[PDB]
Amino acid sequence: SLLTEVETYVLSIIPSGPLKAEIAQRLEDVFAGKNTDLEVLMEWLKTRPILSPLTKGILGFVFTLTVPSERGLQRRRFVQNALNGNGDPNNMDKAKKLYRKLKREITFHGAKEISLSYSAGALASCMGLIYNRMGAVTTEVAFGLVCATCEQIADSQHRSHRQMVTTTNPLIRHENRMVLASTTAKAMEQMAGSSEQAAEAMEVASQARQMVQAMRTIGTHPSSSAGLKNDLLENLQAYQKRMGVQMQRFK
Amino acid sequence: SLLTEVETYVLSIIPSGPLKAEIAQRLEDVFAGKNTDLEVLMEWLKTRPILSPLTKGILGFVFTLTVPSERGLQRRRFVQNALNGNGDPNNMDKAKKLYRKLKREITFHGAKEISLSYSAGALASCMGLIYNRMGAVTTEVAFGLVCATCEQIADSQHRSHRQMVTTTNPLIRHENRMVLASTTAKAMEQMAGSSEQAAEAMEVASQARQMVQAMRTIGTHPSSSAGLKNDLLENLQAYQKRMGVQMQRFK
Amino acid sequence: SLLTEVETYVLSIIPSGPLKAEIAQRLEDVFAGKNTDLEVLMEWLKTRPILSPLTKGILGFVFTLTVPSERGLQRRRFVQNALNGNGDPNNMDKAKKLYRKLKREITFHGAKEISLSYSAGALASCMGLIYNRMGAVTTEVAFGLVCATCEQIADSQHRSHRQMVTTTNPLIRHENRMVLASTTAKAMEQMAGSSEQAAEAMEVASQARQMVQAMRTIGTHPSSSAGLKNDLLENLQAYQKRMGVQMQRFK
Amino acid sequence: SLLTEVETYVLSIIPSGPLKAEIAQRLEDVFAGKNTDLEVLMEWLKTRPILSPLTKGILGFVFTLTVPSERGLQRRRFVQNALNGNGDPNNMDKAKKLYRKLKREITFHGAKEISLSYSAGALASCMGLIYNRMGAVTTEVAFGLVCATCEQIADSQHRSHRQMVTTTNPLIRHENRMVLASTTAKAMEQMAGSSEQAAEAMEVASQARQMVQAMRTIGTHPSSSAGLKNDLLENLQAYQKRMGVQMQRFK
Amino acid sequence: SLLTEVETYVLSIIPSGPLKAEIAQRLEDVFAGKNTDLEVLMEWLKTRPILSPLTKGILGFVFTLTVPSERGLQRRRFVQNALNGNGDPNNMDKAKKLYRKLKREITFHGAKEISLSYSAGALASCMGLIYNRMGAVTTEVAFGLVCATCEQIADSQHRSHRQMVTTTNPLIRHENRMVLASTTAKAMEQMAGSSEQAAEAMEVASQARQMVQAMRTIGTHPSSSAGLKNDLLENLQAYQKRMGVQMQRFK
C-alpha cells in the first residue's frame, strides 16, 4: 500500500506523546475523507509545541496533497520558510536537478530510491519547490520524496538514541522510574475506561499514581522506586490482560 | 464478461484506501444504471486526493461511455489535458496509426492485443483522440484500450513493489506495526457493526486502537508492537470468523 | 433552444452580484413578454454601476430586438458609442465584410461559427452597424453574433481568473474569509425567508454575520476566521438542506 | 468574483474597530443597490476619525464608481488632494504611462498584475487621474488598480505588525489584558442580544466588564488580570457556543 | 489592532481610581462613535483631580483626533501649554527633526520605534507641534508617538514602584490593611449589585466596611487588621465566585 507507507515515514519523525497520538488521528481522517478543512489544520499545526520547523513543514506538504479538494489557497508561510533550509546557495540547482528528475517518475519506490541517493537536506528544497509549482509531479512521487526526507531523519535518531550515554546519578534514575510509572498508569486509566469493568485496574493504576505523588511529597530515598513499573503491570496482569488490551509490551 | 474485465483493469491502478472503496461503488452503480449524473461525478473526481492526472483521465474516459445517456457535453478539461502526455510530437501519428486501426475492430481482446503490442504512453494520446471524436470506435473496443493502457501501468507497479528495499530501522518498523493494526482494527469495527453481535469484536478491535494510542502517548520501545496484528486477529478469530466475515486474509 | 442559448452567452460576461441577479429578471420577463417598456430599461442600464461600456452596449442590442414591439425610436447613444470601439479605421470594411456575410444566413449556429472565425473586437462594429440598419439580418442571426462577441469575452476571463496569483498576506486572506461568510450568510437569510420555518437558519446565518462584525470590531487575529464558511454551512446543513434549497454548492 | 475581491482589498487597509464594521455595511449596501446617496456618504467619510487621507481617498474612488447612477457631480476635494501625493514631479508621466496602459485592458487581473509591477505611491496619481477623466478605463480595470494600491499597503503593515517589539513592562501588559477582555466582553453582549436566551452570557460578559472596572477602581496588582480573556470564554463556552456563534476564535 | 494598542499606552499612565474607570468609558465610547462632543470632554478633563498637566495634554491630543468630526475649533490651551515643557530651547529643532521624520511614515510601529529612539520629553514638543499643524501626519502615526511618549512614562513608574522602600511603622501598615479592605469591599458591593442574588455578598462586604469603621471608632490595636482582606474574600469565595465575577485576583 501507499498510505500505510506514508504515515509510517511521517509518524516516525515526530516525538512521542499526545501530539503524535493526535496527529495520527488527523492523518487518519484526512485519508478516509471525513469532513475536514485545511486552514484549520495548518493553523493548529503552526501554534504547536515541540516540533522541528522542518517537521511542521513536511506535515504541511502532506496535508496539502491528501485533502479532498484542490484549494490552491495561499501557500502558508511556515512551510515555505521551513523547507528552504535558510537559503543554502549550494543546492539551488541540486534540488532543481531532482525536481526535473522526479518529474519523470510515475511510481513510488522509483522516487524514494532516487531521493535516498542524494543529500539529507536538499530534499527539503525540492519539497519547497514542489510546494510552489506542483504541476507534473504526481502525488505518489511526492510521497516517495517525503518518505525519503523522513528516512534520512529517522536514521539520524537511530544513530542518536543508540549512541546515548546512560545516567549514573540515582536522583535522575529515581525520577525516570516515577515518570514511566506515572505515565504508564495514566494510559491504563484510559485503556480501561473504554472497557466493561473499568473498576479494578483503573484503581490499581490510580494508586500507583498516588504512591508516586507521595514519594515526591515525602522526599523518599531513590531505592524505593526500584521495581515500580513492573510491579504495577503485575497487579493488573489479570484484569487489564484479557478484560483490557494486553501487557508485557509497555515495559 | 466485459464489465468484470474493466473494473479489474481500472481498480488495479488506483492506490489502496477509501478512495478505491468509493470509486468501486461509483463504477458499480454506473454499470447497473442507477439514477446518476456525470458532471457531478467529474467534479468529484477532479478535486480528489492522490491520483495521477493520467488516472483521473482514464476514469473520465470510462464514466463518459458507461453512463445511461449520450450527453455529449463539454469534454471536461482535466481529461483532455491528461491524456495528451504534455504534447509529445513523436506519437501524434502513432496514436493516429492506432486510432485508425482500432476503428476496424468489433471485439474486446482484438483491441487489447493490438494495443499491448504498442507503447505504454502513446495509448493515452489515442484515448485523448477518442475523447474528441468517438465516432466509429465502439465502446467495447475503447474498453479494450484502457484495459491495455492500465495493464502497462499495473506492470509498472509490479516491477516496483517487488524491487523494493525493505527497511532496517526499528522506529519505522515500529510504526508500520502500529499502522497495520490501527488500520486493520478500524475495518473490523465496520465489518462487525453490520452484524448481529457487534459487541465482542468491536471492543477487541477498539482496545487495540487504544493500546496503539498509548504507545505513541508513552514513547514505548520498538520491541512492543511485535506481534500486534496477528495477536489482534487471534482474539477475534472466534467472533469475527463465523459471526463476521473471515480472517487469515488480512495478514 | 435559442433563448436559453442567449441568456447564457449574456449573463456570463456580467460580474457576479445583485446586478446579475436583477438583469436576469429583466431578460426573463422580456422574453416571456410581460408589460415592459424599453426607454425605462435603457435608462436603468445607462446609470449603472460596474459594467463595461461594451457590456452596456450588448445588452442594449439585446433588449432592442427582444421587446414586444418595433418601436424604432432614437437609437440610444451609449450603445452606438460603445460598439464602434473608439473608431478603429482598420475594421470599417471588415465589419462590413461580416455584415454582408451575415445578411445571407437564416440559422443561429451558422452565424456563431462565422463570427467566431473572426476578430474579438470588430464584431462590435458589426453590431453597431446592425444597430443602425437592421434590415435583412434576422434576429436569430444577430443572437448568433452576440453569442460570439460574448464568447470571445468569456474566454478572456477564463484566461484571466485561471492565470491569477493567489495571495500570501494573512490580512487579505482574513478578510476574504469574512466576506465569503458574511456574503453567503446574507443569501441564506433570503433563501430561508421564503420557506416555512425561516427561524432556525435565519438565526444561524445572522449570528455568523454578527461574529464577523465582532472581529472587525475587535481587531481579531487572522487565525480565527479559519473554517468560518464551512462551519456555517454545517450548522444549517440540517435546516437549510431539506427545509431550504441545498448546500455543499456554495463552497 | 469581483466584488468579493474588492471589499477584501479595501477592508484590509482600514484599522480594526467600529469604523471598519460600519464601512463594511456601506460597501455592502452600495453593491446590492439599496436606496443610497453619494454626497451623504462622502461627507460622512470626510469627517471621520483615524483614517489615512490616502485611505479616505481610495474609498471615495470606490463609492463613486459603485453607486447606482452616473452623477458626475463635483469631484470632492479630499480625494483629489489625497491621491496626488503632495505633487511628486517624478511620477507625473509614470502615472500617465500607467493610465495609458490601463486604458487597453478589459479584465481585472490583467490590471492588478501590471499595477503591482510598479511603484507603491504613483498608483494613487493614476487613481487621481482616473478620478478626473474616467473615459476609457472601465470600472473592472480601476478595481484592479485599487486592489493593487491597497495590496502595496497591506504588505506595508504585514512587514510592520510582524517586525514589532513586544512589551516588557507589566503595567502596559496589565492594561492590554483588561482592554482585550473589556472589549471582547462588549461584543459578546451584542452577539448574544440577537439570540433567544441573551440572559446567561450577557451577564457572564457584563461582570467581566465590572471586574475590570474594579481593578482600575482599586489599583490592583498586574498579576491579577493573568488569564482573564481565556477565563471569560470558558464561562460562556456553554451558552455562547451553540446558543450563540462560536468561540476559540476571539483569542 | 490599533485602538487596543492606544488605550493600553494611555490608561497605563493614569493613576488608579474612579478617574481611570471613567476615562476608560470615554475612550471606549469615543472610538465606537456614540453621540459625543469635544468641548464637553475637554472641559471635564481640565477641571480634573490628580493628573499631570502632561497627562491632561496627551488625552487632549487623543480625543481631538479620535472624535467623529473635524471640528478644528480653538486648540484648547491646557494642552498647548502642557506639551511645550516650559519652553526648553534645546529641543525646538529636535522636535522639528522628529516632526519632519514622522511626516514620512504610514504605519504605526514605524513611528513608535523612531520615537522611542529619542528623548523622553521632546516627544511632547512634537505632539504640541502636531497639535498646531496636523497636515501630513496621519492619525496612525500620531498614535505611534503618544504610545512612545506614554511608554517613556510607564517605564518611569516601573523604575519607581519597584525601587520603593516598604514601611516599618505599624500604624501605617494598619491603615493600609483597612484601606485595601474597605476599598475592595466597596467594589464587591458594586460587582454584586449587577447580579441575581446581590444579598449574601453585598452584606459580607458591607460588614467588613463596618468592622473597619469600628476600629477607627475604637482605636484598636494594629494587630487586629492582620488578615482582613484575605479573610473577606474567603467569606464570599462561595457567592461572589460563581454567582459573581471571580476572586484570587484582587489580592
Author numbering:
A (entry chain C), B (entry chain C), C (entry chain C), D (entry chain C), E (entry chain C): 2 to 252
Q: What did the paper state?
A:
Ultrastructural analysis has revealed that the matrix shell within intact virions is formed by a single-helical layer of M1 that is closely associated with the viral membrane. Here, we show that recombinant, soluble full-length M1 from IAV can assemble into 2 different oligomeric forms.
Mutation of V97 to a lysine, predicted to disrupt hydrophobic interactions at either of the C2-symmetry and lateral interfaces observed by crystallography, led to the formation of single-layered oligomers. We observed relatively straight M1-V97K tubes in vitreous ice and determined a 3.4-Å cryo-EM map. The M1-V97K oligomer is a hollow tube assembled from approximately 21 asymmetric units per helical turn, with inner and outer diameters of 124 Å and 248 Å and a helical pitch of 42 Å. The structure of its NTD contains 9 α-helices (α1–α9) and is identical to the previously solved crystal structure. The CTD forms a helical bundle comprising 3 α-helices (α10–α12) that connect to the NTD within the same molecule via extended connecting loop 9 (CL9). Within each strand, M1 subunits interact via the stacked interface observed in the crystal structures of NTDM1.
